[PDB]
Amino acid sequence: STIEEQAKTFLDKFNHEAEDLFYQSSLASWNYNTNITEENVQNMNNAGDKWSAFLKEQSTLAQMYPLQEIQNLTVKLQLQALQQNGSSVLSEDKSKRLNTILNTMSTIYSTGKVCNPDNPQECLLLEPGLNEIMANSLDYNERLWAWESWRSEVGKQLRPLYEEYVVLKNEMARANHYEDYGDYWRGDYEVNGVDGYDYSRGQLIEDVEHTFEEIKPLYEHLHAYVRAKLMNAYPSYISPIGCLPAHLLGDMWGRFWTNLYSLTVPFGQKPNIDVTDAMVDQAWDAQRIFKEAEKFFVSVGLPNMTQGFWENSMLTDPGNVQKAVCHPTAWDLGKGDFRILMCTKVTMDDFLTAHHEMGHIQYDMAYAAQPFLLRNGANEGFHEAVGEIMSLSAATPKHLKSIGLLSPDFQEDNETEINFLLKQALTIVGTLPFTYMLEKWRWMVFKGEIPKDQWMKKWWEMKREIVGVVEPVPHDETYCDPASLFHVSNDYSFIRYYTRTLYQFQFQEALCQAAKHEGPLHKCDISNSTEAGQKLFNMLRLGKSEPWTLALENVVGAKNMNVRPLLNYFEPLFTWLKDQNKNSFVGWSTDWSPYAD
Amino acid sequence: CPFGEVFNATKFPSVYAWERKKISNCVADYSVLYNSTFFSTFKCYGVSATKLNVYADSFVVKGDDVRQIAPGQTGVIADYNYKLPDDFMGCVLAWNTRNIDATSTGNYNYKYRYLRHGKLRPFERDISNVPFSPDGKPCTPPALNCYWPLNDYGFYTTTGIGYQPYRVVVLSFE
Ligand SMILES: *[C@@H]1O[C@H](CO)[C@@H](O[C@@H]2O[C@H](CO)[C@@H](O[C@@H]3O[C@H](CO)[C@@H](O)[C@H](O)[C@@H]3O)[C@H](O)[C@H]2NC(C)=O)[C@H](O)[C@H]1NC(C)=O
Ligand SMILES: *[C@@H]1O[C@H](CO)[C@@H](O)[C@H](O)[C@H]1NC(C)=O
Ligand SMILES: *[C@@H]1O[C@H](CO)[C@@H](O)[C@H](O)[C@H]1NC(C)=O
Ligand SMILES: *[C@@H]1O[C@H](CO)[C@@H](O)[C@H](O)[C@H]1NC(C)=O
Ligand SMILES: *[C@@H]1O[C@H](CO)[C@@H](O)[C@H](O)[C@H]1NC(C)=O
Ligand SMILES: [Cl-]
Ligand SMILES: [Zn+2]
The missing domain is CATH 3.30.70.1840 (Spike protein, C-terminal core receptor binding subdomain)
Incomplete structure (x- = not known):
């Protein structure tokens, strides 16, 4: 029959052979994360490798079914996925040595320590201790040291490897019929051959930048405001018209401005919406947390969790003797086995996380009907978007009343609302230029637009001009600060962090509207609306089966990305910022420096 | 009884x-x-x-x-x-x-058929374990387009x- 009808059969053998082979890996991996052990570690590897070897084998096998000969969208997709040559397309040792680079980079990052320039016996690792300085300390110099040490002791180490990294990667990328490794990454957003819902690898760059422009006014003002507060905490270190010193930004790179909340709280006399000590008050436990999120979804017409979810999950740290990795992750194992691994503590933050992770599970349960290879978020940004959307609703002063955590008689004045929005803006709005700029540098570096000898020159040009942030110490090409960030030195597309942010709001504004919600968009909770349920679930059940443009269009009403909902959420922060900025300066100069003096 | x-x-x-x-x-x-x-x-x-x-x-x-x-x-x-x-x-x-x-x-005892040139008539039974080729050909696996028609349930x-x-x-x- 048609090589199509053939390829269908190939895929049908694959799906069964993989569904199983994955489940096995899955399960070993599971055994390990809950029970770290020599026996349990070794096992995780064995199953994991029969796996990647099965993938390699089936990849080389699908490589024999010619894509330019299929007229079924669905199977073309599955094949496309399978027949990615990847790192195989290189020479025996080119691929070998590349993996050598990628490996030590990952290591010297995770292993890298730094010691006091006066006390050589106290040596700090990035986690914790060092990022703890960078998140708490208000001592200008102490911070400057921590900022510089990282970028000097480890940046300079990563420089030569990142140098060779870009070469071999761009080689692989071009050999796969892409323009550069960057183009290879935007490929995730690509959709060809579906009239109307298509999207080209370039249509991203322009879309991102176009959307990013509309952020400026919001961002600029956030900037101006925090710029000003910061001056008060670091007297005489900051120019009321220049950029922000990179090392004063509350995390190590300045990706998030979360921790500057201490320093920038609008109305710091007003207290905190925090029910942690009132969950303990009604002697709540793990199961109550999850049973409650479970309610939250059953409330919008999604299903309960599986019996095997409640049977097979792990919602609490099981004390000592048996030690388990606590990172809140939600597991989609295969064979309708869904579960969560979370070291739940009776706390608001853990309560919210529980909603967020259980939101991943739901999406998983949704696209499960789908054939194996189509079981994923529409694009790299959909899953987490959905994750956050559940935190967003579950945190509103409204939800907390009904759930009997926040006291009925509590009122919500327009000042608490501003505090909360600013808390958000620090995290959500802070990181958007950071992310965009970060990725722009890479993209260009991959496009061959930034010469080796100006790598740190354009990096900091762009930080000053886009992000509005100045290096406290000048860096020559001896450093490699862009790669001092986990994602960059550990080979990771970073723009997903930008686009996920943008969707989550488009999803909410849509969901909230359909839930018939009255007030400001940030007070919205979708609880109890089966209507909001249906619309969400409508995209949710697709997985990768349709193009991310349709999946979007299934909930939002458009084929493309849109920054307006994200703005609409921060409207009453924006207006309020403009006032605070009344007698402040909005925008910055790229010429001022905290050292050139 | x-x-x-x-x-x-x-x-x-x-x-x-x-x-x-x-x-x-x-x-x-x-x-x-x-x-x-x-x-x-x-x-x-x-x-x-x-x-x-x-x-x-x-x-x-x-x-x-x-x-x-x-x-x-x-x-x-x-x-x-x-x-x-x-x-x-x-x-x-x-x-x-x-x-x-x-x-x-894992219990892979139980099997079931996923490939056959032709659907079954009711109450019919197929116990045949022949390597399958979608073009009715003879089949010598692990050659491409050869498949064993029986799958372990697991x-x-x-x-x-x-x-x-x-x-x-x-x-x-x-
Ligand atoms: C493109 O490829 C896929 C191949 O899977 C096609 O979808 C599949 O094709 C058949 C249609 O003959 C579907 O069978 C139907 O199943 C439902 C199940 O309840 C039944 O009600 C129908 O009477 C029929 O038996 C099958 O479900 C479907 N397979 C999958 C994976 O869902 C698709 O048709 C192809 N495109 C075209 C139109 O050429
Ligand atoms: C955890 O560790 C024990 C060793 O004391 C081992 O026997 C057991 O198989 C492990 N449990 C799990 C989760 O597999
Ligand atoms: C939905 O929420 C309200 C309060 O928010 C609660 O009283 C009502 O009974 C809930 N119903 C369901 C089915 O979730
Ligand atoms: C959700 O789970 C509990 C299990 O005891 C059950 O009482 C409730 O009826 C379930 N809801 C659904 C979707 O049937
Ligand atoms: C098996 O048969 C006995 C009667 O001889 C009966 O008690 C029992 O319920 C039966 N079990 C099943 C699985 O039907
Ligand atoms: Cl940096
Ligand atoms: Zn998540």
Whole structure:
């Protein structure tokens, strides 16, 4: 029959052979994360490798079914996925040595320590201790040291490897019929051959930048405001018209401005919406947390969790003797086995996380009907978007009343609302230029637009001009600060962090509207609306089966990305910022420096 | 009468190689099963009364595969392993057997067919294990486009209910 009808059969053998082979890996991996052990570690590897070897084998096998000969969208997709040559397309040792680079980079990052320039016996690792300085300390110099040490002791180490990294990667990328490794990454957003819902690898760059422009006014003002507060905490270190010193930004790179909340709280006399000590008050436990999120979804017409979810999950740290990795992750194992691994503590933050992770599970349960290879978020940004959307609703002063955590008689004045929005803006709005700029540098570096000898020159040009942030110490090409960030030195597309942010709001504004919600968009909770349920679930059940443009269009009403909902959420922060900025300066100069003096 | 021999049996077959037990004359009352929340399906396609007085088909399938033991019905299991006639019928019973037919570790005893040049006629059986080629060719695996038509179900204790093992017993009337 048609090589199509053939390829269908190939895929049908694959799906069964993989569904199983994955489940096995899955399960070993599971055994390990809950029970770290020599026996349990070794096992995780064995199953994991029969796996990647099965993938390699089936990849080389699908490589024999010619894509330019299929007229079924669905199977073309599955094949496309399978027949990615990847790192195989290189020479025996080119691929070998590349993996050598990628490996030590990952290591010297995770292993890298730094010691006091006066006390050589106290040596700090990035986690914790060092990022703890960078998140708490208000001592200008102490911070400057921590900022510089990282970028000097480890940046300079990563420089030569990142140098060779870009070469071999761009080689692989071009050999796969892409323009550069960057183009290879935007490929995730690509959709060809579906009239109307298509999207080209370039249509991203322009879309991102176009959307990013509309952020400026919001961002600029956030900037101006925090710029000003910061001056008060670091007297005489900051120019009321220049950029922000990179090392004063509350995390190590300045990706998030979360921790500057201490320093920038609008109305710091007003207290905190925090029910942690009132969950303990009604002697709540793990199961109550999850049973409650479970309610939250059953409330919008999604299903309960599986019996095997409640049977097979792990919602609490099981004390000592048996030690388990606590990172809140939600597991989609295969064979309708869904579960969560979370070291739940009776706390608001853990309560919210529980909603967020259980939101991943739901999406998983949704696209499960789908054939194996189509079981994923529409694009790299959909899953987490959905994750956050559940935190967003579950945190509103409204939800907390009904759930009997926040006291009925509590009122919500327009000042608490501003505090909360600013808390958000620090995290959500802070990181958007950071992310965009970060990725722009890479993209260009991959496009061959930034010469080796100006790598740190354009990096900091762009930080000053886009992000509005100045290096406290000048860096020559001896450093490699862009790669001092986990994602960059550990080979990771970073723009997903930008686009996920943008969707989550488009999803909410849509969901909230359909839930018939009255007030400001940030007070919205979708609880109890089966209507909001249906619309969400409508995209949710697709997985990768349709193009991310349709999946979007299934909930939002458009084929493309849109920054307006994200703005609409921060409207009453924006207006309020403009006032605070009344007698402040909005925008910055790229010429001022905290050292050139 | 010999029902305890049938669906009380220690050993149940694969779907593709299903078993048929010939029951004649023996006096039954049905109450042996009628009153029990031991079963999970028990949907009949003919009647459901009791007149004191027949074929019994036994095999094991996946949760999500029970749907397919009925007139009409979709694929794989209904298409290549066990087809039930559009008309003519009796009763279909099922029960979850995770406890017996699953090892936490994996039980790949049970198989089923996923490939055949041609759908089955009802009550037909295929026990043939020939490497399959979609162009009716001879086949010498692991050559490309060669496939063994039998797939191991793989019953882990922990999977979703739709993926746990169910014993099935079809009662036909003659
Ligand atoms: C493109 O490829 C896929 C191949 O999977 C096609 O979808 C599949 O094709 C058949 C249509 O003959 C579907 O069978 C139908 O199943 C439902 C199940 O309830 C039944 O009601 C129908 O009467 C029929 O038997 C099958 O479900 C579907 N497979 C999957 C994976 O869902 C698709 O048709 C191809 N495009 C075309 C139109 O050429
Ligand atoms: C955890 O560790 C024990 C060793 O004391 C081991 O026997 C057991 O298999 C492990 N449990 C799990 C989760 O597999
Ligand atoms: C939905 O929420 C309200 C309060 O928010 C609660 O009283 C109501 O009973 C809930 N119903 C369901 C089915 O979730
Ligand atoms: C959700 O789970 C509990 C399990 O005891 C049950 O009482 C409730 O009816 C379930 N809701 C649904 C979707 O049936
Ligand atoms: C098996 O048969 C005996 C009667 O001899 C009965 O007590 C029991 O309920 C039967 N079990 C099943 C699985 O039907
Ligand atoms: Cl940096
Ligand atoms: Zn998440």
